[PDB]
Amino acid sequence: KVFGRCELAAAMKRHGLDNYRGYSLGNWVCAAKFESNFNTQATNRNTDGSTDYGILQINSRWWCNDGRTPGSRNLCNIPCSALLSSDITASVNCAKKIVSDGNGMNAWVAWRNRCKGTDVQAWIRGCRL
Ligand SMILES: [Pt+2]
Ligand SMILES: [Pt+2]
Ligand SMILES: [Pt+2]
Ligand SMILES: [Pt+2]
Ligand SMILES: [Pt+2]
Numbered sequence: 001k002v003f004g005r006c007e008l009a010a011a012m013k014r015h016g017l018d019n020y021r022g023y024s025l026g027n028w029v030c031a032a033k034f035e036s037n038f039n040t041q042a043t044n045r046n047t048d049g050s051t052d053y054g055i056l057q058i059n060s061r062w063w064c065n066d067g068r069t070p071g072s073r074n075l076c077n078i079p080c081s082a083l084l085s086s087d088i089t090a091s092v093n094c095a096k097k098i099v100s101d102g103n104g105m106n107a108w109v110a111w112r113n114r115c116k117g118t119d120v121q122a123w124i125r126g127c128r129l
């Protein structure tokens, strides 16, 4: 699924991301835009052999099992393929764990580099929420 902007904001709100760990909904929408271009099916291999999955590019090193990332963890207890669904439940659940682990949204390199310290409120502009 390739979400529209306000469509993803609505879905993220529904699943509990708005102000989750103090991160406003625009921060999560901005993170998704630069991670996946709002595409639930997005996958990208990392240089260390791990792969990032889904709308928020959750990495197989730590968070899910893809059967091809040696000596990695599966801290969200899910197959990485779960993160590619048109339903964002699995990705949101796992992201709540990630963001709560002490590094906040700095886990998402695209967030730290493209959204942090920017006017993120702009990402929810116009949206019915
Ligand atoms: Pt789809
Ligand atoms: Pt849709
Ligand atoms: Pt939910
Ligand atoms: Pt929740
Ligand atoms: Pt949903």
Ligand SMILES: [Pt+2]
Binding pocket: 093, 094
């Ligand atoms: Pt959970």
Ligand SMILES: [Pt+2]
Binding pocket: 101
């Ligand atoms: Pt950690």
Ligand SMILES: [Pt+2]
Binding pocket: 129
């Ligand atoms: Pt609301």
